[PDB]
Design a protein around this ligand. Structure first.
Ligand SMILES: [Zn+2]
Ligand SMILES: [Zn+2]
Ligand SMILES: [Zn+2]
Length: 840
């Protein structure tokens, strides 16, 4: 009969079915197809029981029903099913799930691995196959379960001790820790002043020669102030300059490795300004159109064919001097493994300019990938480097030059700009005298560590083996949405909440917060994959340690438990009761609170103030200075050397807070005036004062309010529009049930139109317009004006059903019909006491 082959990526399937034709039926799982959804509720939620030998409850993904289904019937007309997922443990597990979802007998299943697309591979695939590795499968189940336990058992602790909506995770929490540590590193940085002196001179001929002072009395020349710099210039001005040595030497430049997911993101970010998510979107398009290989990879390897293809191209398009004697070698990691391959063009002969079916940005990304791939296999660039040593009294001066002799790989990947050594030096020999023209002293300051960028953090994660190609982007977003860090000017900033959570987690879950936790986990997982350990036993050890930490964290702070959030007061008057005010962190952000929150109802105060931070605006034109000056800009805490971070409380007042808050309690208040935002979201203009209006959340769901503290004009969210003017006139219907939820529908009016909405609106958020027949059924409830809509024609000339819509261009209600949810292109309007109907 016909053989059924299953792979992970659809694009790869279509390609396999080709180099195999009919007789076989290739398809793809398009991912995992199945996954997870003492206390019984907790176990039901987790989908795994740590107290019952790890029994689990897998269930098809809410978006793979079709895939699974269409894969079902296909198993009938199939003789022998060939699971062809990736050889790693994740792929191995997808194979295991397929086999248990399709059912059948073990013998009806086979495991095959495809090397490449070449027929020299798709053939050998069925040549010497095998079956699924249970050890590999269990290794992946162990990882998946450990990640589950941590997230579903630690987060709740956070909800109790810190705030609701918070989360913790093996990968997630260390990514934040990295940002938090860099933040503290920057805030504590103190710029150091240092001076440099350069001298312009003339050779015996008359040529110009620029020199840098390197030594004085044989010690590195590095004055720290103007005074010292002057003492030196005074001596250099009177000194005799003579050449000591001229060292001419041939130097080379080497191309880099082809791209992997992390490096592609970094290169796209530095040369094209692309964000991680965007880069992956374009890369995805390119892959699906067959121009490049999978965009998710951690290996820079190249097949022999790939290498012959590129050398073949270099040979015809550049000549011999560009083609190395033998393939360029790189990456010798002894622990390295083999997976898919590096990101490169599927066909070197295809130029970016010929992809007229792709967006311009996708062509730019392709060009980046192409050039990196071709330069990688070309010859080195060759330069003649010259170094001049000069003596002047007790000083030593230097000059370095470089002249390009052969571009090599830079022919395809040019030097964006000339470097400091990309210059020439005049002919001068040892012993020659030099004539001093002028001395230029320069003041400098060391700069703080650079802030992370999305690609930059990804780079750090991969360096420590923390994430995965398919999850890097996802990680960068989660930590933002959770409110732990924020991005500004394409750079990361740690939020107060991130610091709070990072400190708590480090205090009560040190092991989990160690950067190498993943590496250590990988070792144990490999042992399970290699029959050197049993998976349930490994999970049991893990769980025992974890529960020891969790239970300890649950206790009161005095017994070693997790510290619950802490109020730090400050001199500010609560607008409701004037009292001193304190600085607080919630999952929403960092905010100003009044101690009456901790007093029982009688004396309770729920007034709160939002703390707008002063965003650091790094000047790109300052280059390396830009971060140092940012650190200089900050105030410094009175009680400690730690820098201070700055916030706005009034159009007259500004607030400074220490970096080690709340461990350090220093605060400062300044007559500083700037602007303040009530919160953030859909920008709206307040009709009562023209100021910006934002979107806010609270105990009553979502409302819209104006940033001007002098105006409380508040709009609101509605079912099928951006915002609703002030508030409007609603009517409830208990007889219309919701369909996605158990709620009932209510009828509402506004500038947007007339709409149905669910009674638990902030939670249900269910959306639809009313049908004319519905209105006719509840015509008695309709307010007097709305009755006409019930008079409207209930069905169109085709007998389809009709709905009520708002014509914004004419500010009036109309009725329209839909078939298969699409508009029929028919409408009826109300014009002077009559209903008129026709084509849209
Ligand atoms: Zn108060
Ligand atoms: Zn301090
Ligand atoms: Zn307003």
């Amino acid at each position: 009969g016909k053989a059924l082959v299953i792979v992970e990526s659809p694009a790869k399937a279509k390609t396999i079915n080709k180099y195999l034709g009919s007789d076989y039926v290739v398809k793809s799982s398009v991912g995992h197809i199945r996954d997870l959804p003492e206390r019984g509720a907790l176990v039901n939620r987790m989908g795994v029981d740590p107290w019952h030998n790890w029994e689990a409850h897998y269930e098809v993904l809410p978006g793979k029903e079709k895939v699974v289904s269409e894969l079902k019937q296909l198993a009938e007309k199939a003789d022998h099913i060939y699971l062809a997922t990736d050889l790693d443990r994740e792929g191995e597990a997808i194979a295991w799930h397929l086999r248990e979802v399709i059912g059948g007998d073990d013998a009806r299943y086979s495991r095959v691995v495809f090397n490449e697309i070449t027929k020299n591979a798709i053939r050998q695939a069925f040549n010497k196959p095998g079956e699924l590795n249970i050890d590999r499968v269990n290794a992946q189940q162990a990882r998946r379960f450990m990640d589950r336990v941590v997230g579903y058992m630690v987060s709740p602790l956070l909800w109790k001790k810190i705030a609701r909506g918070l989360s913790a995770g093996r990968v997630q929490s260390v990514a934040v820790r990295l940002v938090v540590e860099r933040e503290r590193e920057i805030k504590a940085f103190v710029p150091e002043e240092f001076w440099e002196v350069d001298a312009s001179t003339t050779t015996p001929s008359g040529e110009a020669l620029a020199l840098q002072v390197t030594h004085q009395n044989d010690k590195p020349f590095r004055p720290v102030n103007k005074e010292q710099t002057q003492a030196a210039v005074s001596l250099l001005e009177k000194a005799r300059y003579s050449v000591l040595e001229r060292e001419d030497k041939p130097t080379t430049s080497k191309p880099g490795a082809p791209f992997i997911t992390s490096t592609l993101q970094q290169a796209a970010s530095t040369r094209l300004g692309f964000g991680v998510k965007k880069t992956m979107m374009m890369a995805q398009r390119l892959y699906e159109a067959g121009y490049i290989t999978y965009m998710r990879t951690d290996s820079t390897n190249l097949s022999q064919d790939a290498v012959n293809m590129v050398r073949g191209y270099i040979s015809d398009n550049f000549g011999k001097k560009y083609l190395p004697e033998s393939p360029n070698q790189y990456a010798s990691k002894e622990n390295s493994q083999e997976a898919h391959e590096a990101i490169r063009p599927s066909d070197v002969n295809v130029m970016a300019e010929s992809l007229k079916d792709m967006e311009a940005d996708a062509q730019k990304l392709y060009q980046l990938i192409w050039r990196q791939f071709v330069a990688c296999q070309m010859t080195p660039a060759k330069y003649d480097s010259t170094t001049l040593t000069v003596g002047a009294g007790d000083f030593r001066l230097k000059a370095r030059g470089r002249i390009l002799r052969f571009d090599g790989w830079t022919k395809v990947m040019p030097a964006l700009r000339k470097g400091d050594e990309d210059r020439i030096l005049p002919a001068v020999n040892k012993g020659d005298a030099l004539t001093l023209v002028e001395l230029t002293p320069a003041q400098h300051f060391t700069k703080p560590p650079a802030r992370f960028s999305e690609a930059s953090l990804v780079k750090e994660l991969e360096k420590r083996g923390i994430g995965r190609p398919s999850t890097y982007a996802s990680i960068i977003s989660t930590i933002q949405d959770r409110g732990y860090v924020r991005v500004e000017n394409r750079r990361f900033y740690a939020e107060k909440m991130g610091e709070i959570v990072t400190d708590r987690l480090e205090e009560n879950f040190r092991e989990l917060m160690n950067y190498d936790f993943t590496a250590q986990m990988e070792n144990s997982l490999d042992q399970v994959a290699n029959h050197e350990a049993e998976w349930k036993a490994v999970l049991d050890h893990f769980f025992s340690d974890f529960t020891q930490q969790l239970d300890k964290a649950e206790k009161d702070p005095e017994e070693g438990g997790m510290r619950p959030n802490q109020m730090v007061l400050t001199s500010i008057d609560c607008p409701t009761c004037g009292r001193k005010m304190g600085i607080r962190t919630a999952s929403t952000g960092v905010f100003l609170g009044c101690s009456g929150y901790a007093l029982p109802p009688k004396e309770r105060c729920k007034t709160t103030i939002n703390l707008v931070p002063e965003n650091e605006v790094l000047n790109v034109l300052e280059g390396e200075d830009a971060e140092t000056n940012a650190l200089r800009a900050k105030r410094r805490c009175p009680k400690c050397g730690t820098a201070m971070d700055s916030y706005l409380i009034d159009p007259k007042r500004k607030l400074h807070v220490c970096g080690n808050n709340p461990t350090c309690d220093g605060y400062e208040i300044e007559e500083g005036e700037f602007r303040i935002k009530g919160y953030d979201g859909p920008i709206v203009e307040c009709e009562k004062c023209g100021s910006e209006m934002h979107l806010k959340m609270g105990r009553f769901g979502k409302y819209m309010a104006c940033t001007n503290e002098e105006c409380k004009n508040t709009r609101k969210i509605l079912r099928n529009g951006e915002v609703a003017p002030p508030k409007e006139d609603p009517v409830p219907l208990p007889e219309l049930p919701c369909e996605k939820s158990d709620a009932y529908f209510v009828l509402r009016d506004g500038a947007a139109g007339v709409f149905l909405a669910a009674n638990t609106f902030p939670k249900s958020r269910e959306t639809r317009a009313p049908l004319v027949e519905e209105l006719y059924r509840f015509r008695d409830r309709l307010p007097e004006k709305l009755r006409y809509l019930a008079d409207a024609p209930q069905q169109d000339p085709e007998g389809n059903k009709t709905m009520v819509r708002f014509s914004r261009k004419t500010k009036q209600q109309y009725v329209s019909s839909e078939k298969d949810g699409k508009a029929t292109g028919w409408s009826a309007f109300y014009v002077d006491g009559k209903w008129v109907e026709g084509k849209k």
